[PDB]
């Protein structure tokens, strides 16, 4: 058969994911609810498939991916999000994920992603907005962001303050300000209303 | 309710794709065997789906892709190829296709790409070598080629010589040795052996 490790802090998502994998004769080696032990458990148990939420606490899902790939892990890693996060897929792809899937539309895209991977394909959100319409220059601006700048952005859009971010990202306040300036500058935003509107327009 | 145009000149590949589409309840508005009329007929007929082989004569399959997208067509485009062309996929992704599929492993990845596109995802070959192991730099040198260098490389690897290519690509024998030089320079290859060896090492 085929087996997996699931990494998600959301109790309901864990359940639906678990339930989906069983339904498809995939055996679950372990279930994790934080990212700080993830690298280790993955490397030890060596599952065919890893499913990781992009927002696990401790060490986030993309940081786990970069670390695993850096350390020559060659399994299927599928990243998932509770948000739409369609712009984030590109960054996950650049880091070596086999796919990125939003849980918003349910669990079938996860199994679809696992299938693609089994066949040598990767499975990521498509933005027509990269190639068509008036939103292309906005859409590359997003593509220029650092992994970390993206974290801070998404945290700002959830309305978190510098301290909440620092604590979550295990960085100092100054490092958050710095990432926040770099972020704003790349987005051509000066004020919070600029950012609000930027986000509305690109539907983040 | 779903419909397609198929653009391939390989008689068996046409038959197989046609059959596959039919069995998945996809109507075929038209079948083409060259790329000269392709932009026009797509825009005339407005199919949900277009399936284009990367080597149709006249206007190159990825050229069509680019044209349709700069001319704002917003349907599903899936490039296909008779060879593995693993690296070619990134270029089609960067040019706005929804997917790239090798016919080598059969038609079932075409229907899967289509189901991906219908769910808002794209379906491209996964290159582990881009992220893990000893071939990561080679793997990005291939990513650097221009559309024209690729065409030429793919021809060298096919066994065409300078004349065949000049004829094939509609150009003079020295616009080809031009392309041939930047190609080799980007791939850091001196001799034909350096190239053969590179192609063996990276599986092209």
The DSSP annotation for A156-175 comes to HHTT--HHHHHHHHT--HHH
Render the burial of B112-145: b for 16+ CB within 10 Å, e for the rest.
Answer: bbbbbbeebbbbbbbbbbbbbeebeebbebbeeb
By the 10 Å C-beta count (0-12 exposed, 13-18 middle, 19+ buried), A204 is classed as: middle
Q: How many CB pairs under 8 A join A and B?
A: 75
Resolution in A: 2.7
Rounded distance between C-alpha atoms, residue A96 and residue A186, angstroms:
24
Q: Do A120 and B133 touch (CB under 8 A)?
A: no
Domains and their CATH numbers in chain B: 1-129 (3.40.50.2300), 130-204 (1.10.10.10)
Q: How far is A2 from chain B (nearest CA, A)?
A: 19
Experimental method: X-ray
Q: Is residue A37 classed as helix, strand or coil in its secondary structure? A: coil
Separation between Cα atoms, residue B35 and residue B56, nearest integer Å: 6
The residue of chain A with its CA nearest to that of B125 is A121
Q: Compute CA distances A49 → A62, A118, B49, B125, whole Å.
A: 15, 10, 31, 17
- Cα distances from A166 to residues A133, A152, A161, A171, A176, in angstroms, run 36, 9, 9, 5, 6
What is the separation of C-alpha A55 from the centre of its chain, rounded to a whole number of angstroms? Answer: 7
A153 CA: distance to closest CA in chain B (Å): 24
Q: Which residues contact B192 (CB under 8 A, 6 or more apart)?
A: none
Interchain pair B74, A128: CB under 8 A: yes
Closest CA to A133 of B87, B71, B193: B71
Maximum C-alpha span of chain A: 53
How many whole angstroms separate alpha carbon B57 and alpha carbon B70?
21
With b for 16 or more beta-carbon neighbours within 10 A and e for fewer, the B183-203 pattern comes to bbebbebeeeeebeebeeebe
| Beta-bridge partner residues of B7 | B32, B52
Residue A1 host element (H or E): none
- From the list B40, B36, B26, B43, the residue with the least C-alpha distance to B61 is B36
- Other beta carbons within 10 angstroms of residue B14's beta carbon come to 18
Helices and strands (H, E) in chain B, number of each type = 10, 6
Q: Long-range CB contacts (< 8 A, 24+ apart) of A54-59? A: A54/A79, A54/A80, A54/A81, A54/A85, A54/A88, A54/A92, A54/A100, A55/A9, A55/A81, A55/A82, A56/A7, A56/A8, A56/A9, A56/A32, A57/A9, A57/A168, A58/A34, A59/A35
Q: Which residues of A touch B (CB under 8 A)?
A: 69, 72-74, 86, 95-96, 98, 101, 105, 108-109, 112-113, 115-117, 119-126, 128, 130-133
What 3-state class would DSSP assign to B149?
Answer: helix
Burial, A10: exposed, middle or buried (Cβ in 10 Å; 0-12, 13-18, 19+)?
middle
β-pairing, A99-102 vs A76-81, is: parallel
Question: Between the CA of residue A135 and those of A129, A139, B42, what are the distances in Å?
Answer: 6, 6, 24
Tokens standing for residue A8: 């998600």
């Amino acid at each position: 058969a085929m087996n997996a490790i699931i990494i998600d802090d959301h109790p309901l998502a864990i359940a639906a994911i678990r339930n989906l994998l069983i339904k498809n004769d995939i055996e679950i080696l372990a279930e994790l609810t934080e990212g700080g032990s993830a690298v280790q458990r993955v490397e030890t148990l060596k599952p065919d498939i890893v499913i990781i939420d992009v927002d696990i606490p401790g060490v986030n899902g993309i940081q786990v991916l970069e670390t695993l790939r850096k350390r020559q892990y060659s399994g299927i890693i599928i990243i998932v999000s509770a948000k739409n996060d369609h712009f984030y897929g590109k960054h996950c792809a650049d880091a070596g994920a086999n796919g990125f899937v939003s849980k918003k539309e349910g669990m079938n895209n996860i199994i679809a992603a696992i299938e693609a991977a089994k066949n040598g394909y990767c499975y990521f959100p498509f933005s027509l907005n990269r190639f068509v319409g008036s939103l292309t220059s906005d859409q590359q601006k997003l593509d220029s962001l650092s992994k970390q700048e993206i974290s801070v952005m998404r945290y700002i859009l959830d309305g978190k303050d510098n301290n909440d971010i620092a604590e979550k990202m295990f960085i100092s306040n100054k490092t958050v300000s710095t990432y926040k300036s770099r972020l704003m500058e790349k987005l051509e935003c000066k004020s919070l209303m600029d950012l609000y509107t930027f986000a509305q327009r690109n539907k983040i």
